[PDB]
Structure formats: C-alpha cells, structure tokens
Design a binder for this molecule. Structure first.
Ligand SMILES: [Mg+2]
Ligand SMILES: [Mg+2]
Ligand SMILES: [Mg+2]
Ligand SMILES: [Mg+2]
Length: 128
RNA sequence: GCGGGCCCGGGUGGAGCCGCCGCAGGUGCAGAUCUUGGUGGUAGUAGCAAAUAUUCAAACGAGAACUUUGAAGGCCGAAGU
C-alpha cells in the first residue's frame, strides 16, 4: 500500500540491453564502457551486418516517461531533512533518495519525516 | 540515461569527503618492436652425457649412494690429478 503516483503510464523503451564496447569481450583491458570506433577498417564503425550496434539519437526514450522509475516516480537525492522538506509539493511525482553517506542515526529521522509528509523513499529500510 | 557515466542495497575498510555557482590545468589510452613492475601457456618440458669406476662393513646421526673409518678394485703414472 505505497503512495501511488499521479500518473502511471506504460513505459516503453526502444532498447534495454547495454551498449558494449567493440572487442570488450576479447580483452580484459577493454572495458564495457562505450567508445566510438574510429578505425579505417572497422566492421562496427561502418555498420556491417550482424555486428555490435552503435548508440544513436534514435534510441532516445519518450520525454513523457524519461527518467521515470518503474513505480512511476523520479529519483531525488536527499542528504538531510531540510532537503527532504523541499519535495513537499512534488510528492505525487517525485520520490526522495537517501544518500549512501548518511548515517543510520539520521536516516530514521529522514524516513519518519518523509512518512509524515507523505513522500516515498526508495530505500526506507536500508541500513537500520 | 541513446551515450559519455551516474544514484541506491550488501560486504571489507578505518578518517576524511562531496554537490552547486565561477576560476585554473602536468585533466580521460588499446596499440607507439612505448617505460616500469608483476603474472601465464610453453612446462614438470629442453636439460643436469668432454677427460675408464666403483663395491662391501661399521660409526656419528631423526634422516646416508655422496660424511668419516677399515677392506677391495681403479686412475693421475715424476713435462702428474
Ligand atoms: Mg595498458
Ligand atoms: Mg577503407
Ligand atoms: Mg625429461
Ligand atoms: Mg691414460
């Protein structure tokens, strides 16, 4: 019985797999982070058949559901209760995110204040 | 998040750290027979073959083919090992 968002449309994604760098599987020194190929003779660079896809502007997500969580909210990093009170007038569209560096002593106070103000927390029972 | 990357959960860690508005740079690596350091397959592999040769018993010793003692068989054969 969580706080439902104002609008929960169907989120559609053009692609969900990560874009992996070319030859990142063959070598350990080559990481999964994408790098634009620029070789003169590169199958991926000139889009050969059955090769690794390159990121394009076409894969852009719909602006209505962009940055939207599966619940229907948007993340907002919160470091203290004063920053939590900012989301008072955006509770139905945005949810508070508690920073990892916040100690457990203040995390419970932030969670209690969010419950009082009716703001969803994506990590309410995080550290205890 | 198209992406460069980023935000949380868990574990280790024990003392500093980050966001924003601007400023500045010794600021982003897959190659350069690049420099330094480390680690693999090869691989328990090549190899431990130049100059005739060792054997028996005892002692010390936890442990003896290689140490010592005694016996036997050999070599260097006075421009000699
Ligand atoms: Mg390198
Ligand atoms: Mg060409
Ligand atoms: Mg052998
Ligand atoms: Mg002779």
């Amino acid at each position: 019985a969580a706080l439902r968002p104002l609008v929960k449309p169907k989120i559609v994604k053009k692609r969900t797999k990560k874009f992996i760098r070319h030859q990142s599987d063959r070598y350990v020194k080559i990481k999964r982070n994408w790098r634009k190929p620029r070789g003169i003779d590169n199958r991926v660079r000139r889009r050969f058949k059955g090769q690794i896809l390159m990121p394009n502007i076409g894969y852009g997500s719909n602006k209505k559901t962009k940055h939207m969580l599966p619940s229907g909210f948007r993340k907002f990093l919160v470091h203290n209760v004063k920053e939590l009170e900012v989301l008072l007038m955006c509770n139905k569209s945005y949810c508070a995110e508690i920073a990892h560096n916040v100690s457990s002593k203040n995390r419970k106070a932030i969670v209690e204040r969010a419950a009082q103000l009716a703001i969803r927390v994506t990590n309410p029972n995080a550290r205890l």
